[PDB]
Amino acid sequence: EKLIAQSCDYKAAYLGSMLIKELRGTESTQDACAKMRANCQKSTEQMKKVPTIILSVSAKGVKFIDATNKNIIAEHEIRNISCAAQDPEDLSTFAYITKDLKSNHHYCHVFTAFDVNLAAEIILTLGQAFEVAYQ
């Protein structure tokens, strides 16, 4: 139940959970990311800095725990995740879509990593997990 090599645990930053009415694929994630990242700043530089959350992703499920208050935000099966995308120009920002059953909608959960490889790894780990769980 440790899955030291079967799961990855990183410190991400919870940017936002954007509610999507109709899921149009990566468009929704790209839209949320671009719109919000630009809304998060002005004529300023990369002021894209949000609260840290421990992004733990496993082939059996993904769990989001707060890094400050260790708040058990949510633990959802990887089978509940539908797709995982990232920002077209910012590979340090990842946004994945889930099937939020209690919402009857799809929330684009976008987090900003503190490292490109870190974010890219999460994307790959999510994709691989969903891919292997698909079959």
Domain boundaries defined on the chain: 1-135
User: Rounded to an integer, what distance in angstroms lies between the CA atom of residue 85 and that of residue 104?
Assistant: 21
β-pairing, 52-58 vs 93-98, is unpaired
Q: Write out the CATH class of domain 1-135.
A: mainly beta
Q: Where are the alpha helices (DSSP H) in the chain?
A: 26-39, 116-134
Listed as own residue / partner, the contacts of 36-42 with beta carbons closer than 8 Å and 24 or more positions apart are 36/110, 37/87, 37/90, 37/93, 40/15
Structure-determination approach: NMR
User: Rounded to an integer, what distance in angstroms lies between the CA atom of residue 135 and that of residue 125?
Assistant: 16
Give the CA angle between residues 95, 104, 65 to the nearest 5°: 45
Q: Any bridge partners for residue 7, and if so which?
A: 58
β-pairing, 52-58 vs 7-20, is antiparallel
